[PDB]
Design a protein around this ligand. Structure first.
Ligand SMILES: [Cl-]
Ligand SMILES: [Zn+2]
Length: 153
């Protein structure tokens, strides 16, 4: 799958820029079913000066956009300065109506497998946003989380 880099500008409110050596991979679901709410759209949204949340990769059924370098943290896990925000790579999976969720999930599993090998991160350390904050996210993968992970391998 193609990865397009379009970083949030340095110094922005949602680009804290703390050095990070990722030990985890945190999975999210955008909860945005609107037609057109794809990876490129999120890339554009994240660059708005007033946004405060941020993660590393947004995945849709066609491509993947990277908003942050992997040596920097993002604000997405909701655990302050805990490992979610300060020691994990955040990934968002789109739910846009004009996209195939099954194929977006497959693309995300490919990305996660690649990240695991390149950053020496174990499958056990691939966690849902919920793990860090108890929030019901990734809403479409929670009830079948273990299966989603079995599909990574
Ligand atoms: Cl979230
Ligand atoms: Zn989340």
């Amino acid at each position: 799958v193609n990865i397009i880099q379009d970083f949030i500008p340095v110094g922005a409110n949602n680009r804290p820029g703390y050095a990070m050596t990722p030990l985890y991979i945190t999975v999210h679901n955008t909860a945005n079913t609107a037609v057109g709410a794809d990876a490129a759209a999120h890339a554009r949204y994240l660059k708005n000066p007033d946004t405060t949340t941020s993660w590393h990769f947004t995945v849709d059924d066609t491509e993947i956009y990277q908003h942050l370098p992997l040596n920097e943290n993002g604000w997405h896990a909701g655990d302050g300065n805990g490992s979610g925000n300060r020691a994990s790579i955040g990934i968002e999976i789109c739910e846009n109506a004009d996209g195939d969720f099954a194929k977006a999930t497959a693309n995300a599993q490919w990305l996660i497998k690649t990240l695991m090998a390149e950053h020496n991160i174990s499958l056990a350390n691939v966690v849902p946003h919920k793990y860090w904050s108890g929030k019901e996210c990734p809403r479409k993968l929670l009830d079948t989380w273990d299966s989603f992970k079995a599909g990574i391998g």
